[PDB]
Amino acid sequence: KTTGIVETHFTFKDLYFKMFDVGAQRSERKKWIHCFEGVTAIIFCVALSDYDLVLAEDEEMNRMHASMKLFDSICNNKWFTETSIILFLNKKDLFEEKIKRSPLTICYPEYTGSNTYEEAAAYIQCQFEDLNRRKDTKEIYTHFTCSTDTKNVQFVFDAVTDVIIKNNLKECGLY
Amino acid sequence: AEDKAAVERSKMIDRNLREDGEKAAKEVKLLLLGAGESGKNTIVK
Amino acid sequence: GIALTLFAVLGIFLTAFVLGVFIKFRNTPIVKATNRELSYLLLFSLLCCFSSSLFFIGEPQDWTCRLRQPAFGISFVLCISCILVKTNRVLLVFEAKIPTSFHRKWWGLNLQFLLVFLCTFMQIVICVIWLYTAPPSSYRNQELEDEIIFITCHEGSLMALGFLIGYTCLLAAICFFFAFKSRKLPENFNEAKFITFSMLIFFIVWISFIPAYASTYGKFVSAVEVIAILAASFGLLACIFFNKIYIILFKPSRNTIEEVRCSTAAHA
Amino acid sequence: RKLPENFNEAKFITFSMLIFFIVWISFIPAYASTYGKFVSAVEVIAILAASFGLLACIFFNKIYIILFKPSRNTIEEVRCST
Amino acid sequence: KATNRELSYLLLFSLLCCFSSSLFFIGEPQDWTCRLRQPAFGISFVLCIS
Ligand SMILES: CCCCCCCC/C=C\CCCCCCCC(=O)OC[C@@H](COP(=O)(O)OCC[N+](C)(C)C)OC(=O)CCCCCCC/C=C/CCCCCCCC
Ligand SMILES: CCCCCCCC/C=C\CCCCCCCC(=O)O[C@H](COC(=O)CCCCCCC/C=C/CCCCCCCC)COP(=O)(O)OCC[N+](C)(C)C
Ligand SMILES: CC(C)CCC[C@@H](C)[C@H]1CC[C@H]2[C@@H]3CC=C4C[C@@H](O)CC[C@]4(C)[C@H]3CC[C@]12C
Ligand SMILES: N[C@@H](Cc1c[nH]c2ccccc12)C(=O)O
């Protein structure tokens, strides 16, 4: 019925999680971007299959470049200096299917090498993880989605636990 | 009289405010970003 | 006595050197993983413990027989309490996986010093009570050997001496249980293979010197006491510090944030 | 010491030998100081301490895994081989 | 059976001998006792360490 922020709630191993989806706002990001300060982690999603898809429909903008630009803008905000990012590279089946039909070299002028999933994934990831510059305070966790099993929830739970532990140690001053 | 009623109402409001805040403090908040058609739907499901 | 004096001076020098390294590299992640303030307090207490062995050499005047034991007792209790508080706080931080907690004030920096003071108050109150009521004094014994005169101090209380030893031994024993609980902590925060060895060094030197104290009398008793004190202090210092000092000065590549991030992550 | 084969046996043997060395260096000063009936005692304490050390370090852990503790947990050959 | 089943028995017997050797020291010294104190301990301990 209502538009705007959508909230989903679930409990995993006695931890209560809250997730806010802000994709329906369609307004200036800066005005509402200072309201979300204080979150524990930021979940970020990227599709590998957009390398050879002109999703944007603009010749100048390729979906991968747009995703990289958005990730760069989000990661280096003044407010989110100390919030970690859980990066989810998604759709690894179709991407692996199309690599041999059209290699990864279309997106980047530099060669990925070998035209196969392991090498291609490494090049796309390294290129996404190098966008950050506050390496001292924030870190990125990367998981390739697995549909059948529950690796998706467990990875988020473990990442949140690690973030909480590292936050407490830093406050004590030990870390 | 009126001061007593106001004080009692304030103390009832304050007690409810404290406990609810303590309960909220025990939750983890996550922000889900992503351009549309990036598979956000699959993670949510 | 010259050898004992030289060894005490060397111990003081090495104690000062470790403190100088910690101050030069305070920012480094390895040094910051260990509690820096408690480290300084432990080093100062260790300097006091090493310097307290100089009261056992020379003519035993009355003003020395009262300060021979309590100085060492308080100095060693300070180190034990510092070690205990340093280990319990790391355990409290790691166990708190929960987002929120009531133990926020429990791990506060100021509370640590109060706990170290509470663990030495008992040793301070037995000493003051002992000195006020039945103080030690010097006496000359001509009975042992008809031809030679010896100068020694008589404590005047043997129950008071027993209580200090019992309290120190009790604290050393708890240092075993807290060392045992900490074996599963990650690297750069786990120290369980040194505390137990230091406590065992102390127990073996003192337990070994029981026969001599019960049988021998004369100048030898003081030499045995000095040797035991010096050996215990050296063992504690070495086990606690010389590993980290080596990693910091030699192999400096380890003192990097990436290493400590990789270390803490192994827990999850 | 790094090798994890057989319940960390190398680590245990190394820890046991250090106790022996510590016990015996501490013996020399005690012996010279004692004269009379207690000269004999300084030998029994050393022997007992060393014997209690070696046996406990080498066997305590395996005995727990075998009896008076979980059985069929790490008892399997799989656990001994690794 | 992963460990050697015979060296373990030999080591336990040697440790028993080492434990029992200390009993000879306690007691009024006699000619045969002092001749048998040291060698028993030495042999038993060497048997254990070996
Ligand atoms: C000359 C006369 C002296 C007479 C006394 C001598 C008696 C003989 C001494 C000892 C027998 C036992 C020796 C104990 C050695 C401990 C071994 C050790 O060091 O292993 C270190 C740590 C574990 O290893 P880790 O952390 O590196 O890896 C673990 C990493 N993970 C968890 C991920 C796998 O093990 C731990 O937790 C440590 C747990 C604490 C050990 C308890 C020992 C208590 C001994 C008390 C002696 C008191 C004397 C009695 C007085 C009576 C006189 C009449
Ligand atoms: C962590 C531990 C810290 C401790 C530091 C360890 C290093 C100390 C180094 C040297 C100590 C001082 C040197 C003492 C000389 C003065 C002695 C004295 O003055 O004896 C005076 C005369 O000589 C002597 O009888 C004999 C000298 C003693 C020889 C020791 C025999 C036992 C041997 C051990 C040797 C095997 C070595 C194997 C290595 C083991 C390592 C794992 C009189 O003395 P007395 O009448 O009062 O009693 C005498 C009581 N009776 C007779 C029972 C001794
Ligand atoms: C009761 C005391 C005085 C004598 C017996 C010593 C026992 C309690 C001590 C000595 C060596 C210790 C072991 C040292 C190493 C390890 C490996 C660790 O991963 C689990 C604990 C464990 C297995 C310890 C258990 C307790 C232990 C066996
Ligand atoms: N003479 C004391 C030596 C001593 C002084 N202070 C101590 C503190 C702890 C243990 C021993 C001591 C003893 O009987 O051993």
Curated annotation (Swiss-Prot), chain A:
Residues 17-26 are annotated as: G3 motif. Residues 86-93 are annotated as: G4 motif. Transmembrane segments: none annotated. (Microbial infection) Deamidated at Gln-25 by Photorhabdus asymbiotica toxin PAU_02230, blocking GTP hydrolysis of heterotrimeric GNAQ or GNA11 and G-alphai (GNAI1, GNAI2 or GNAI3) proteins, thereby activating RhoA. GDP binds at N90, K91, D93, C146, S147. Changing S73D: Decreased affinity for PLCD4. It is found in: Cytoplasm; Cell membrane; Cytoplasm, Cytoskeleton, Microtubule organizing center, Centrosome. The modification ADP-ribosylcysteine is found at C172. Changing K69M: No effect on binding to CCDC88C. The modification Deamidated glutamine is found at Q25. Mg(2+) binds at T2. Residues 145-150 are annotated as: G5 motif. GTP binds at K1, T2, V22, A24, N90, K91, D93, L94, C146, S147, T148. It comes from the Eukaryota. Changing K78A: No effect on binding to PLCD4. Belongs to the G-alpha family. G(i/o/t/z) subfamily. Heterotrimeric guanine nucleotide-binding proteins (G proteins) function as transducers downstream of G protein-coupled receptors (GPCRs) in numerous signaling cascades. The alpha chain contains the guanine nucleotide binding site and alternates between an active, GTP-bound state and an inactive, GDP-bound state. Signaling by an activated GPCR promotes GDP release and GTP binding. The alpha subunit has a low GTPase activity that converts bound GTP to GDP, thereby terminating the signal. Both GDP release and GTP hydrolysis are modulated by numerous regulatory proteins. Heterotrimeric G proteins are composed of 3 units; alpha, beta and gamma. The alpha subunit contains the guanine nucleotide binding site. GTP binding causes dissociation of the heterotrimer, liberating the individual subunits so that they can interact with downstream effector proteins. Forms a complex with CCDC88A/GIV and EGFR which leads to enhanced EGFR signaling and triggering of cell migration; ligand stimulation is required for recruitment of GNAI3 to the complex. Interacts (inactive GDP-bound form) with CCDC88A/GIV (via GBA motif); the interaction leads to activation of GNAI3. It is linked to Auriculocondylar syndrome 1: An autosomal dominant form of auriculocondylar syndrome, a craniofacial malformation syndrome characterized by variable mandibular anomalies, including mild to severe micrognathia, temporomandibular joint ankylosis, cleft palate, and a characteristic ear malformation that consists of separation of the lobule from the external ear, giving the appearance of a question mark (question-mark ear). Other frequently described features include prominent cheeks, cupped and posteriorly rotated ears, preauricular tags, and microstomia. This is Guanine nucleotide-binding protein G(i) subunit alpha-3.
UniProtKB/Swiss-Prot annotation, chain E:
Expressed in the temporal lobe, frontal lobe, parietal lobe, hippocampus, and cerebellum. Also found in kidney, lung, liver, heart, skeletal muscle, placenta. The chain crosses the membrane at residues 6-25, 32-50. Ubiquitinated by RNF19A; which induces proteasomal degradation. N-glycosylated. It comes from the Eukaryota. Residues 26-31 are extracellular. It is found in: Cell membrane. The extracellular regions of the homodimer interact in a side-by-side fashion while facing opposite directions. Each extracellular region consists of three domains, LB1 (ligand-binding 1), LB2 and CR (cysteine-rich). The two lobe-shaped domains LB1 and LB2 form a venus flytrap module. In the inactive configuration, the venus flytrap modules of both protomers are in the open conformation associated with the resting state (open-open) and the interdomain cleft is empty. In addition, each protomer contains three anions, which reinforce the inactive conformation, and one calcium ion. G-protein recognition is mediated by the intracellular loop 2 (ICL2) and the C-terminus, which contribute differentially towards the binding of the 2 G-protein subtypes G(q)/G(11) and G(i)/G(o), resulting in distinct CASR-G-protein interfaces. The C-terminus confers selectivity for G(q)/G(11), while it contributes less to G(i)/G(o)-coupling. The C-terminus adopts opposing orientations for G(q)/G(11) and G(i)/G(o)-coupling. It is linked to Hypocalciuric hypercalcemia, familial 1: A form of hypocalciuric hypercalcemia, a disorder of mineral homeostasis that is transmitted as an autosomal dominant trait with a high degree of penetrance. It is characterized biochemically by lifelong elevation of serum calcium concentrations and is associated with inappropriately low urinary calcium excretion and a normal or mildly elevated circulating parathyroid hormone level. Hypermagnesemia is typically present. Affected individuals are usually asymptomatic and the disorder is considered benign. Homodimer; disulfide-linked. Interacts with VCP. Interacts with ARRB1. Belongs to the G-protein coupled receptor 3 family. This is Extracellular calcium-sensing receptor. It comes from Homo sapiens (Human).
